[PDB]
Amino acid sequence: KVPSDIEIAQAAKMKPVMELARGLGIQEDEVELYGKYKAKISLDVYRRLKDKPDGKLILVTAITPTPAGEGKTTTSVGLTDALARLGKRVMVCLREPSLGPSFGIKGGAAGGGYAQVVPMEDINLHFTGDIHAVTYAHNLLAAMVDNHLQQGNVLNIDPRTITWRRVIDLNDRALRNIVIGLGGKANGVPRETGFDISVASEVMACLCLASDLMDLKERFSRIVVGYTYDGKPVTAGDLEAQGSMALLMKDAIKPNLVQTLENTPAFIHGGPFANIAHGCNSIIATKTALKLADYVVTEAGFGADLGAEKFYDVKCRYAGFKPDATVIVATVRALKMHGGVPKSDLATENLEALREGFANLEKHIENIGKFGVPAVVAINAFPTDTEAELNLLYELCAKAGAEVALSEVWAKGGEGGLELARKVLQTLESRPSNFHVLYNLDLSIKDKIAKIATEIYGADGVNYTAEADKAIQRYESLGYGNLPVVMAKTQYSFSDDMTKLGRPRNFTITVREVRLSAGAGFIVPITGAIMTMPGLPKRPAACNIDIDADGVITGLF
Amino acid sequence: KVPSDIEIAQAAKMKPVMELARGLGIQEDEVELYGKYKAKISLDVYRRLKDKPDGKLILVTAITPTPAGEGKTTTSVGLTDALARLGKRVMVCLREPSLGPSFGIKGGAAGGGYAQVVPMEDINLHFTGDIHAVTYAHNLLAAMVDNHLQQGNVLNIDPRTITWRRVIDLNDRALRNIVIGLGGKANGVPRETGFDISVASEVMACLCLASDLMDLKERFSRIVVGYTYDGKPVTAGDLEAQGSMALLMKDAIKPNLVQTLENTPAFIHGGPFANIAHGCNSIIATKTALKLADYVVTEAGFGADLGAEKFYDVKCRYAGFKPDATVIVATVRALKMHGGVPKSDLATENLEALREGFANLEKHIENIGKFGVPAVVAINAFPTDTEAELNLLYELCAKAGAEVALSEVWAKGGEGGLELARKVLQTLESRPSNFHVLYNLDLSIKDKIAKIATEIYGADGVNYTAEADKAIQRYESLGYGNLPVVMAKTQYSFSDDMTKLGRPRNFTITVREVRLSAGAGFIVPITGAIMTMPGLPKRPAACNIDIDADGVITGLF
Ligand SMILES: Nc1nc(=O)c2nc(CNc3ccc(C(=O)N[C@@H](CCC(=O)O)C(=O)O)cc3)cnc2[nH]1
Ligand SMILES: Nc1nc(=O)c2nc(CNc3ccc(C(=O)N[C@@H](CCC(=O)O)C(=O)O)cc3)cnc2[nH]1
């Protein structure tokens, strides 16, 4: 019945963004176009509306992701659209995808089916240059670190302690571990380093946490790149790179106006990793949306154990936001995997594995309650789901205390989300939220980790390797112990063990390593090995990709 | 140099309490005397002052108790006294001791040395009859449970499910496990039960948590005594015992006015266990003190892991109190035991075991911070403590962020607490508190236990026996899962293992059993075996006790 994703995006009729912008009260002079259907928007908009009250803030999140798929963005856009149809003044804020995936695994829609922000092609690729700006802001510091050594090493860095890597927005595994500065006294200082994907760059994180260009610059100045032979820290400030980086980011600091299929305005801006970073779109975009609109839908990376958690405990913390509702997105299928059913038999009805798996969802609902935010569940409808199945899922959500709404936004655009929209509105008019972060900053790193781990993961306790112990000891005496904590762990489990589906009990977390992003302003415990630069597959999507004389692009999606 | 405790109490000159009472603004008609030096005070005092603002609330607590002793009450009274000397309008609120200990181990001062509430003799013994009233309110329900069975068992209790024991205020071990109702159809219904010491009676708990006689009566009506053969709960309400119990407690519901050696007014009122109950004096006394005074000192049973915790999470919760400071009482000696030094070598200087043991204190200080209450440490001075020792202890407290003050109240009454008083005043004028309970009631019992366990005990996780699992399951479906949780565990460790002194790491808590006090309004997880009716020793203190023709009492203290 439904057309594929890509073709739906092309045949959509989009409105001139300048139109959308004046519709929202943005003045033409605060708009810088990129074609007819993209625009950067001035940080001045926010500045003149600082005093106006915020609209409502609605977070989208989901249950523990599985191979079976949940489609969280699909829901976000479709929720946005329904809200627009019900006459509400709404925007959606989303993250910019990394360019690289478009060539290994394939690019995919911002959403999918009929729930999508457009123009699709651009947003996957260069969009408005935000990631390029991030790439060169980042690598300029790399080159300045290297130039400093080359020029007599005045700050007295021990080159072997350098933590500041390089970045690029392609999936290139060979760039993981490299030795640079070879060739002789004229070619720099030989040393071991590597590349991570640009979207995992701390500079990408900063962008998303910054309040403006001047706040962004000040963060840059706090970036720790490595240490002295004495074990004193060396920062970008010390290298005096901030102005430059800040300059490279002058256009990057502005959110980008675009639209859903059905022309609902949308910001797309920033887009960090959700394991080593907070997996949220920029504070700047979102804070602007609240001024321009009465309702703002936004989402978070990975399951609610991670994105939701970081959204509240980091994003809202810094921005002084107080989310008003949270929507958890789930499917019958993912729940059944969590209840034990293998990927190939997900089609066979099975109310028992569905009841078993529901625990995963029950535990997320519960977590969101721990932040004082009322929770609505979205069920991404799927054709093989039986009535018995869906019904059970309703009973179970109600038993567990949350409104539930079946969503067919994928299939039917904004119309497939109208009951969901109504449930959210219903929750907003009758269950105002009592926001508070899960933890105070004045705790210790180990206190902060344990509270997340036990309150959110349902972990028994936390383990630490010797290397992690010295890190935390070091970081605390360097005065970074009153920072937020950002768990990088698997997203496929509440546990640090990705094989443990559903709601695992009697387990512990092992923190193996602890890293720092003093620019972004947080501490990063890592549990498994974390892949900050994925590789291409056996056949890369790039082998099929072409564009012909007409400009007809095949093999891409 | 110093006289013993008892003789100090006798030679003290006490003022007529009616005097103290009019001094505080209590009208004569709100006073019922018991001699010249005791009075019950009307709940009407509070009622007419409900609108006045509260004075400051200052909690006294201590580090993990050891065989070496810490003297927490000594500090409380002496702190009260210093405050009085500095011209401040202050009262102290303390618990009534159990009568029984006076005959096994020996009675002891309310405080000690020169820091004491008087008249000593009375407060150990019958005082004003509060515990007797508790004993008979309690046992009337026992006798009504038994009468009900005898009279045809209309409510259809399964006598073997009866949880409501009997109580008495002596240490009588033989009364632990008994079979009653023997002799035949005319003598009641044969069944297994026992006695606990009166001060561990739930009715004692209720008294301390009640807001008035009518609130107290309503609590009584919610007491669960046992179940039906169907597994439905049976309450005192169902037995219609509340009015009666409420009647037995008509005088008991009034706090008792008494004084310190130096004539500072003092309430003594209620006095529950601190493991299966919250180890605090009555809300009623304390709430009245805040109206009558600008500063109120009160204390809590056991270490800060227990009393302090329950004081905040139960007492302040119910009463809507917001403590303004908390004083932790410690000694060089107890810290050294915690650092490893055996009881016999506590006299030998040892800065290393003192540094090691300080961890215990550091961890308590830290906990009190988790409730948003600024912490001052009191050092009970002891003659064998060296300058090097005390100095180290100061450096360590300051390093750990809390004011510290050496206290010689034992030796020198109110004068030995003047620096401490000044430090508290100093903390009150410059570090206002941000009170919040450790946890929300809407969590699950297992969530609530784990948060206490991990945040306060520094436990890894929590274990549960099968019997505890069904209890919690039962209690939750009976609708008692949104109640406070009251840990009964050893007081000699942060862990449930009393052999683990100092600051134990990598341990778990095992909850073996879970009980309910639906009158008092909380849930009682138990970890070790909990002794709710201690025994007399080899030689009981009672074998030496006498009073002669003059009335000279020997052998008692
Ligand atoms: N990737 C992907 N995601 C999708 O969401 C998706 N959806 C469809 C078609 N959508 C659907 C969704 C739900 C039902 C369904 O469950 N129908 C019930 C609704 C039950 C209720 O209202 O409670 C029915 O009564 O027909 C059928 C088709 C096809 N391919 C997809 N592919
Ligand atoms: N059970 C009991 N408790 C006590 O508190 C107690 N105190 C004394 C006598 N009190 C004390 C207390 C402290 C110092 C002491 O440490 N003196 C130091 C003060 C150090 C400082 O100010 O930092 C000194 O300089 O003399 C001496 C005697 C005797 N028996 C007791 N018995």
Coordinates of C-alpha atoms in Angstrom, one line a residue, chain B residues 125-375:
Chain B
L125 CA 11.2 4.7 86.7
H126 CA 7.5 5.5 86.4
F127 CA 8.1 9.1 85.4
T128 CA 4.5 10.2 84.6
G129 CA 3.0 6.9 83.6
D130 CA 3.4 7.2 79.8
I131 CA 4.8 3.7 79.3
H132 CA 2.1 2.2 81.6
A133 CA -0.6 3.8 79.6
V134 CA 1.2 2.4 76.5
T135 CA 1.4 -1.1 78.2
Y136 CA -2.4 -1.2 78.9
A137 CA -3.6 0.4 75.7
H138 CA -1.5 -2.3 74.0
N139 CA -2.6 -5.3 76.1
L140 CA -6.3 -4.3 76.0
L141 CA -6.1 -5.0 72.3
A142 CA -4.4 -8.3 73.0
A143 CA -7.2 -9.2 75.4
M144 CA -9.9 -8.1 72.9
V145 CA -8.3 -10.2 70.2
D146 CA -8.4 -13.1 72.6
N147 CA -12.0 -12.3 73.8
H148 CA -13.2 -12.1 70.2
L149 CA -12.0 -15.7 69.5
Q150 CA -13.4 -16.9 72.7
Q151 CA -16.8 -15.4 71.9
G152 CA -17.5 -17.2 68.7
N153 CA -14.8 -15.8 66.3
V154 CA -17.3 -13.7 64.2
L155 CA -14.5 -11.9 62.2
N156 CA -13.1 -15.3 61.4
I157 CA -9.5 -14.7 62.4
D158 CA -7.1 -17.6 61.9
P159 CA -5.6 -17.4 65.4
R160 CA -2.3 -18.8 64.1
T161 CA -1.9 -15.7 61.9
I162 CA -2.0 -13.3 64.8
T163 CA 0.9 -10.8 64.8
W164 CA -0.2 -8.5 67.6
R165 CA 1.8 -9.7 70.6
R166 CA 1.7 -8.5 74.2
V167 CA 4.1 -6.1 75.9
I168 CA 5.8 -5.5 79.3
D169 CA 8.5 -3.0 80.3
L170 CA 10.9 -5.4 81.9
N171 CA 13.6 -7.5 80.4
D172 CA 12.0 -10.9 80.5
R173 CA 13.3 -13.4 78.0
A174 CA 11.1 -16.3 79.1
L175 CA 8.2 -14.2 77.9
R176 CA 9.5 -14.3 74.3
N177 CA 7.7 -17.4 73.2
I178 CA 4.7 -18.6 75.0
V179 CA 1.4 -20.5 74.5
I180 CA -1.7 -18.9 75.9
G181 CA -5.5 -19.8 76.1
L182 CA -4.9 -23.2 77.7
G183 CA -7.1 -25.1 80.2
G184 CA -10.2 -25.8 78.1
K185 CA -13.2 -24.4 76.4
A186 CA -13.7 -22.0 79.2
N187 CA -10.2 -20.5 79.1
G188 CA -9.9 -19.0 75.7
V189 CA -8.4 -20.3 72.5
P190 CA -4.9 -22.0 72.7
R191 CA -2.3 -20.2 70.6
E192 CA 1.4 -19.3 70.2
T193 CA 2.5 -15.7 71.0
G194 CA 4.8 -13.8 73.4
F195 CA 5.8 -10.5 74.9
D196 CA 8.0 -7.6 73.7
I197 CA 9.3 -4.8 75.8
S198 CA 6.7 -2.0 76.0
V199 CA 8.9 0.6 74.3
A200 CA 8.9 -1.6 71.2
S201 CA 5.1 -1.7 71.1
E202 CA 3.6 -0.2 67.9
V203 CA 1.5 1.8 70.3
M204 CA 4.6 3.5 71.6
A205 CA 5.5 4.2 67.9
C206 CA 2.0 5.7 67.2
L207 CA 2.2 7.9 70.2
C208 CA 5.5 9.4 68.8
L209 CA 4.0 9.9 65.4
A210 CA 0.5 11.1 66.3
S211 CA -0.5 14.7 65.9
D212 CA -3.1 14.6 68.7
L213 CA -5.4 12.2 70.6
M214 CA -7.8 12.1 67.6
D215 CA -5.0 11.4 65.1
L216 CA -3.7 8.9 67.6
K217 CA -7.2 7.1 67.8
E218 CA -7.5 7.0 64.1
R219 CA -4.0 5.3 63.8
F220 CA -5.1 2.8 66.4
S221 CA -8.0 1.9 64.3
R222 CA -5.6 0.9 61.5
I223 CA -3.5 -1.5 63.6
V224 CA -3.4 -4.9 61.9
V225 CA -3.6 -7.6 64.5
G226 CA -3.9 -10.8 62.3
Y227 CA -5.7 -12.3 59.3
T228 CA -8.9 -14.3 58.5
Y229 CA -8.8 -17.9 57.2
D230 CA -9.3 -16.2 53.8
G231 CA -6.1 -14.2 54.2
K232 CA -8.0 -10.8 54.6
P233 CA -6.5 -8.5 57.2
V234 CA -8.2 -7.8 60.5
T235 CA -7.6 -4.5 62.2
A236 CA -8.2 -3.0 65.7
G237 CA -10.8 -0.9 64.0
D238 CA -12.7 -4.1 63.2
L239 CA -12.4 -5.1 66.9
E240 CA -13.7 -1.5 67.8
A241 CA -10.9 -1.1 70.3
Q242 CA -9.7 2.4 69.3
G243 CA -11.9 4.5 71.6
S244 CA -10.8 2.4 74.6
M245 CA -7.1 2.5 73.7
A246 CA -7.6 6.3 73.0
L247 CA -9.1 6.6 76.4
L248 CA -6.1 4.8 78.1
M249 CA -3.9 7.3 76.4
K250 CA -5.8 10.5 77.4
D251 CA -3.1 11.7 79.8
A252 CA -0.3 10.0 77.8
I253 CA -0.8 12.2 74.8
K254 CA 0.6 15.3 76.7
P255 CA 4.3 16.0 76.7
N256 CA 6.1 16.3 80.1
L257 CA 7.9 19.4 81.2
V258 CA 11.2 19.0 83.0
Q259 CA 14.6 20.7 83.2
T260 CA 18.3 20.3 82.7
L261 CA 20.6 20.6 85.7
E262 CA 21.0 24.3 84.8
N263 CA 17.1 24.7 84.6
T264 CA 16.8 24.8 80.8
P265 CA 13.2 23.5 80.0
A266 CA 13.0 20.1 78.5
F267 CA 10.3 17.9 77.1
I268 CA 10.6 14.2 77.6
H269 CA 7.9 12.3 75.7
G270 CA 7.5 8.9 74.0
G271 CA 10.5 6.8 73.2
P272 CA 10.3 4.0 70.7
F273 CA 12.9 1.5 69.5
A274 CA 15.2 2.8 66.8
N275 CA 15.6 -0.4 64.7
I276 CA 11.9 -1.6 64.2
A277 CA 10.7 2.0 65.0
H278 CA 12.1 5.4 64.2
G279 CA 13.9 6.0 67.5
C280 CA 12.6 9.6 68.0
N281 CA 10.7 11.4 70.7
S282 CA 7.1 12.4 70.0
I283 CA 6.2 14.8 67.2
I284 CA 3.8 16.4 69.8
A285 CA 6.6 17.4 72.2
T286 CA 8.9 18.6 69.5
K287 CA 6.2 20.6 67.6
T288 CA 5.2 22.3 70.9
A289 CA 8.9 23.2 71.6
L290 CA 9.2 25.0 68.2
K291 CA 6.3 27.3 69.2
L292 CA 7.5 28.0 72.7
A293 CA 11.2 28.5 71.7
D294 CA 13.5 30.0 69.1
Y295 CA 15.8 27.0 69.1
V296 CA 14.9 23.3 69.7
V297 CA 17.6 20.6 70.3
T298 CA 16.3 17.1 69.8
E299 CA 18.1 13.7 69.2
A300 CA 17.7 10.4 67.5
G301 CA 18.4 6.7 68.5
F302 CA 21.5 4.9 67.3
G303 CA 24.0 6.1 64.7
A304 CA 23.2 8.6 62.0
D305 CA 22.6 5.7 59.5
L306 CA 19.4 4.9 61.4
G307 CA 18.1 7.7 63.7
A308 CA 19.0 10.7 61.6
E309 CA 17.7 8.8 58.6
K310 CA 14.4 8.0 60.2
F311 CA 14.2 11.4 61.9
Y312 CA 14.2 13.1 58.5
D313 CA 12.4 10.4 56.4
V314 CA 9.6 9.7 58.9
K315 CA 9.4 12.2 61.8
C316 CA 10.0 15.4 59.7
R317 CA 8.1 13.8 56.8
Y318 CA 4.8 13.5 58.8
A319 CA 5.3 16.7 60.8
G320 CA 6.5 18.9 57.8
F321 CA 9.6 19.9 59.8
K322 CA 12.7 21.2 58.0
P323 CA 15.7 20.7 60.3
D324 CA 18.2 23.6 60.2
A325 CA 21.4 21.9 61.4
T326 CA 22.5 18.6 62.5
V327 CA 25.3 17.9 65.0
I328 CA 27.2 14.6 64.8
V329 CA 28.8 13.5 68.0
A330 CA 32.0 11.5 67.9
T331 CA 34.9 10.6 70.2
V332 CA 38.6 9.9 69.4
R333 CA 38.2 6.5 70.9
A334 CA 35.1 5.2 68.9
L335 CA 36.9 6.4 65.8
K336 CA 40.0 4.3 66.7
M337 CA 37.9 1.2 67.2
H338 CA 36.5 1.9 63.7
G339 CA 40.1 2.2 62.6
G340 CA 40.8 -1.2 64.1
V341 CA 42.2 -0.7 67.6
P342 CA 40.8 -3.2 70.2
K343 CA 38.8 -1.9 73.3
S344 CA 41.8 -2.4 75.7
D345 CA 44.4 -0.4 73.7
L346 CA 42.1 2.6 73.0
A347 CA 44.3 4.7 75.3
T348 CA 47.5 4.4 73.2
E349 CA 47.9 7.3 70.8
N350 CA 47.4 6.1 67.2
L351 CA 47.0 8.7 64.5
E352 CA 46.8 6.1 61.7
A353 CA 43.9 4.1 63.1
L354 CA 42.3 7.5 63.8
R355 CA 42.7 8.5 60.2
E356 CA 41.4 5.1 59.1
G357 CA 38.4 5.4 61.5
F358 CA 37.6 8.9 60.4
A359 CA 36.1 7.3 57.3
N360 CA 33.0 6.3 59.5
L361 CA 32.6 10.0 60.4
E362 CA 33.3 11.2 56.9
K363 CA 30.5 8.9 55.6
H364 CA 28.0 10.2 58.1
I365 CA 28.8 13.9 57.4
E366 CA 28.2 13.0 53.8
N367 CA 24.9 11.4 54.4
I368 CA 23.6 14.4 56.3
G369 CA 24.5 16.5 53.2
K370 CA 22.2 14.3 51.2
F371 CA 19.2 15.7 53.1
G372 CA 20.4 19.2 52.6
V373 CA 21.2 19.8 56.2
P374 CA 24.5 21.6 57.2
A375 CA 26.5 19.4 59.6

